[PDB]
Subunit: 119 residues, 4 copies
Amino acid sequence: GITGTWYNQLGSTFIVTAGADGALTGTYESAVGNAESRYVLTGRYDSAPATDGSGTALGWTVAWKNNYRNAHSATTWSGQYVGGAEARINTQWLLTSGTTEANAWKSTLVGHDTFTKVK
Amino acid sequence: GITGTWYNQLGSTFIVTAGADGALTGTYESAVGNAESRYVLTGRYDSAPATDGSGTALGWTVAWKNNYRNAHSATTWSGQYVGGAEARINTQWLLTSGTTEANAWKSTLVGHDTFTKVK
Amino acid sequence: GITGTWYNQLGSTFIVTAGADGALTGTYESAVGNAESRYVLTGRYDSAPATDGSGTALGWTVAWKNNYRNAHSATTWSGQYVGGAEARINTQWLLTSGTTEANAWKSTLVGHDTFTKVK
Amino acid sequence: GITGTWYNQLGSTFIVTAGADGALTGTYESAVGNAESRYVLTGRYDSAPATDGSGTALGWTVAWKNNYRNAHSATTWSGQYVGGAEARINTQWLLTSGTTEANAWKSTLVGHDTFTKVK
């Protein structure tokens, strides 16, 4: 049930497709990265998660480059998909903007974003 | 110069291939996640980084599962590739193990790993 | 308005006192660290935040040692206090358990905890 | 052996005093936060760490405000002190700048800083 279209609390939509081998592909839009543009996402997840009831570990990388804009930065999400009546993707993300060696200390951000299927 | 075989300070080898579209593919081995096994990695990077001299924003996801072992966890690296006389990949990473809703607060780890081409 | 008693979404209570010099003192309880025990907290904040409307940069650390239990770990919170009709403390935290040099890669956790005044 | 004057890889000096109760006090200087200014630090650590050989859990908060400069920011270090022939403090830090609700996603930074006693 991981495949689908997901939305975060800031409105950023997360269209994702899961493969049987554990692949993860999709797109990203809506502000937080860049205002209105498509960004290609790719990551991985485990195809055989625990059967006792537990979040499905997954993650994906989105580098903000496309045919229009390029912020020289990538946010790489890492969380687990919690199934149930309402599907949830609670993730922690690290936006790493490409900086010089002097500014490399302030290059990487960190945060959290929770994704739901309804919006 | 981003494509190649990379090693972290703990000995974990990071074989990576970069595509012209910004794709990032490879494998991960050597202990830190699991002792001796191949793990598929996929991520992204910007194909047109800044020309003034700056790290190339990149990232990759590795869900720790293969044909042999499955730790129900995904380790997700996010950093920038710094070129020069010696190539360097300074990254922050978030290993998110799949846990229950009760243990979801202790699911995600954070760290750093720097990758060089020589070992 | 930063001083008070705060609660996170997991029920952990955050009693805090702010000083005019920017000091931050209080206690921490309720499960997430240890089941039922008082833990001393100390941190800092800026006593002259921006007047245009912005979160107040604050942070604190709690090391789980007391007269009863000792987990050899510290979670060190860093966030900003957002004032308004409902007071909010949105924080990111890093639980660093004391490990050996071999396990030092898995020592530090990361997460988020939001604190409100009502519970 | 935790009390002393510590230096990170980027020249930032970390003068710290530890108390028997587990307290932690000191100052911070040298660029990364602000170019040349004193910044008050206070934190905590466990006074009874493991005796089998392991890092001593510690943390501290520094809010960049003083009598001269105020960046409305706090970097809140969380790491363990590793003793031995050379004393080491390997820490992860989260710099949270006080931002508005719109910019609150890009408020918190993440990184690492290792502190040694020699410089």
